[PDB]
């Protein structure tokens, strides 16, 4: 909760705009990703790119504002880190998917901004003290294929969860 100057007074409206932004380009990010992987992903989306809530952080759209922002926070962090690994690998495995790399970063940038804003309402309105950590375990735990799949499943989960988040605030 360290601040460098006064947080903005239209935070909730801004994160709403940020969630919409995410939600409105997630489908394109997903599509870009599998299309860039090639066979056998485009044809087997259901079993290679489904939305698996593995260790993925929870979200109770029915919670209080404070509780949702705290869950949203852990989610963004999780996505944010999952996104770094995905891009790290994708720049190696598919060095040619220029468009893909680009949209990955663009989404990573939007996500950081969301963290800032969420952290700001959480500190300014709820004096939370701080929020608890939860990262995505990228690791070398997987031959090229498991990376591609884990990646594709994350984005699959991302596309689904984001929509749920986008209209719960």
């Amino acid at each position: 909760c360290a601040i460098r100057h006064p947080c903005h007074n239209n935070l909730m409206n801004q994160i709403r705009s940020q969630l919409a932004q995410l939600n409105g380009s997630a489908n394109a990010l997903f599509i870009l990703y599998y299309t860039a992987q090639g066979e056998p992903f485009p044809n087997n989306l259901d079993k290679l790119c489904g939305p698996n809530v593995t260790d993925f952080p929870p979200f109770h759209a029915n919670g209080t504002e404070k509780a949702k922002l705290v869950e949203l926070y852990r989610i963004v962090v999780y996505l944010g880190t999952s996104l770094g690994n995905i891009t790290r690998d994708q720049k190696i495995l598919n060095p040619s998917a220029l468009s893909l790399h680009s949209k990955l970063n663009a989404t990573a940038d939007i996500l950081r901004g969301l963290l800032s804003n969420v952290l700001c309402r959480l500190c300014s309105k709820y004096h939370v003290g701080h929020v608890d950590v939860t990262y995505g375990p990228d690791t070398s735990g997987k031959d090229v294929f498991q990376k591609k799949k884990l990646g594709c499943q994350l984005l699959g989960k991302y596309k689904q969860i984001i929509a749920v988040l986008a209209q719960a605030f």
Partner: protein, 201 residues
Amino acid sequence: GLPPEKPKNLSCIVNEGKKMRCEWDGGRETHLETNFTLKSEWATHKFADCKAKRDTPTSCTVDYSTVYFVNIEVWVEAENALGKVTSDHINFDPVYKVKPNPPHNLSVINSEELSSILKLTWTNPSIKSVIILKYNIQYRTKDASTWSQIPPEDTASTRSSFTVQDLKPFTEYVFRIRCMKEDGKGYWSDWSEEASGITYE
């Protein structure tokens, strides 16, 4: 020689697609070697300082990419052997400082079976997915020295087409259009490529 004056008139612009750029008025010549530094920071993160080049001493294009909907505080620091001063700070959401790309693919059609009617269609710049658009639609006869404009209020929200009417029959017309954030906070885009069309009689 003299110490640096407080820089002023700091203003930033974000051309669609590009990184932010701020400019400012340096002040009275110091006669000394004076360095300018553009500082910027979210409320939770200090960004990389931007040091103005000699070529362009009173302007800086940051190195981080533009993130909308997150207020960013910005200011300029001036310094030389005699003093180190900073400008007043400004704090804004980059969304209100955008200069979209011009709408493109403007084209004319007579899809009305009537004379005094022409319909324009175009493709909006990508920033449409972030901001609601406003437009200025200009038209004139093929052979006319100045442009005429359609009332601003009639083209005040995003759209990809407009049908111009009350035009003179059997006349050729030229068109151009530009856009910017719907609330007027930002910068007008450059004009689109012109498009022509004639009417029935």
